[PDB]
Amino acid sequence: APDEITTAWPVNVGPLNPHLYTPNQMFAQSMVYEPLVKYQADGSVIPWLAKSWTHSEDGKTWTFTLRDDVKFSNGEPFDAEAAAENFRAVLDNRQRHAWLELANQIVDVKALSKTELQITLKSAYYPFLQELALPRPFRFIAPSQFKNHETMNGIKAPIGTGPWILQESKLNQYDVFVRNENYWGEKPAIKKITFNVIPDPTTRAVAFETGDIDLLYGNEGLLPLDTFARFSQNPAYHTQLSQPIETVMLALNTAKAPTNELAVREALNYAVNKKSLIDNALYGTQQVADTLFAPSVPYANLGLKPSQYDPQKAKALLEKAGWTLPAGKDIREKNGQPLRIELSFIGTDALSKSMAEIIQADMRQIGADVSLIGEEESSIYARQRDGRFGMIFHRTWGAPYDPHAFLSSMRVPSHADFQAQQGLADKPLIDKEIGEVLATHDETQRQALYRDILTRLHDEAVYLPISYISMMVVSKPELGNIPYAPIATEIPFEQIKP
Ligand SMILES: COc1cccc(CN(CCN(CC(=O)O)Cc2ccccc2SC)CC(=O)O)c1O
Ligand SMILES: [Cl-]
Ligand SMILES: [Cl-]
Ligand SMILES: [Cl-]
Ligand SMILES: [Fe+3]
């Protein structure tokens, strides 16, 4: 049928517990579960499950007036008690949500009536509404589907208020969603969506070519980029490449030799020809990045000075810091110690491996010996959390996370950014200012704090920005134009109209 589509994802969507993370997939949680307020491309939120709201003068007490016509997909009512119970269930697992500062800011949540929901905060937390709008954890499952009045230990059926319902799941095979015929809002034109589980990018491309699937939708890893380019010229297909959504970069460990030295990090930031990397490894499909955040990101248009590709300058910086070349050797030494840096990445990720090889080659040209450490995903994440890396591939989070939530998370010791920044003398000052910028409502001070944080991170060369990457699409032409969601990690299936 023309109102049924088949697409793909590298893994299953997961159990669709609205309040937990891996192996739950965010786009799928957002298909079934809904927020109080909904994020818009212009950075604002609109009323959603909450039709209106007010707050006290000190900005600590918030009162939401909820819709009274919304039902969970199983018929049960959505009301303020249901919402309040969801906030309780999330915060009963509060430690797990440390990365998201709203989870530490919420003091109290209670239903004042069927339609009035009161939320109290520790402080006037300015990104309050934006974080309520995220795919997780603050979305709502039917309280009847709690397990012993909790969700942190599992749920029963994944019953949301959203436009899609999970029909069935087969582990390592597929997931099937259908349209919610009792949805409170606009009904999707598509009636059924099947997700084929296809972990390999080449196999996803082949699946599209043979006609097994109708739609591919994802970031730069969706399919081989040379294949994507070929597809974009093939009149039998339709392809799309969005405007950039987030940054891909290296994080450099300021607490580990030799990346503990500023001169070394500065030299590394001059050593990479990013334009050539992109044209060589990314088939020319992405944009060069000079800064942690693109100048188009809120609060990030700061006139930060780019470190352009300049091997001569990279060498000079290293020479001045005492890293010089021994007779008949291409790798620099200082105090007998070679300039050796470990670059860790997911070993089975062909794109990461390709970029890593380019980075290694470019840095060898200025006398730095980069050793490639390709490992399984679990081992790489363990390295991120504990700072067992010299350089590591990393990325920002896209809207609405960038920049406030990404910066917020830099304070959390179990994250790559904290670890990479751990060796900076100004790290406590940075973490203090990150705390302040989230709670300030002096707009002038807020901009000044973002400027100081991002400028320190830039001047200290904590990162090696590589690319601003885009969303891409491959689809059967009959599906028409495929729209993008304001939230970079969501997929607007309900907006597709064949
Ligand atoms: C595509 O994945 C993301 C897209 C945009 C933002 C994030 C950041 N996540 C931050 C929290 N995760 C950790 C991380 O991505 O660094 C998930 C998480 C939270 C608490 C405990 C464990 C984990 S997975 C290690 C948001 C989320 O997953 O809901 C993403 O992981
Ligand atoms: Cl989890
Ligand atoms: Cl995952
Ligand atoms: Cl139970
Ligand atoms: Fe995450």
Describe this structure in words.
Belongs to the bacterial solute-binding protein 5 family. This is Nickel-binding periplasmic protein. The chain has 498 residues and is an alpha+beta fold. It has two domains: 1-242 and 471-498, Periplasmic binding protein-like II (D-Maltodextrin-Binding Protein, domain 2), CATH 3.40.190; 243-470, Dipeptide-binding Protein, domain 3 (Roll). It is 29% helix and 24% strand. The protein is built from 15 helices and 21 strands. It has helices at 26-32, 80-91, 102-105, 128-132, 201-210, 225-233, 262-271, 274-281, 311-320, 350-364, 377-386, 404-409, 416-421, 427-439, 443-459, and strands at residues 4-9, 37-39, 45-47, 50-55, 61-66, 106-111, 116-121, 146-147, 150-155, 164-170, 174-179, 192-197, 215-218, 238-252, 287-288, 333-334, 337-338, 340-346, 369-375, 391-395, 463-475. The strands form six sheets. Strands 13, 14, 15, 18, 19, 20 and 21 form a seven-stranded mixed beta sheet that branches. A four-stranded mixed beta sheet has the order 1-12-11-10, with no helix packed on it. A four-stranded antiparallel beta sheet has the order 4-5-7-6. A hairpin with a 3-residue loop joins strand 10 (164-170) and strand 11 (174-179). Helix 7 runs antiparallel to helix 9 (311-320) and helix 14 (427-439) runs antiparallel to helix 15 (443-459). It is globular, with a radius of gyration of 24 Å. The relative contact order is 0.15.
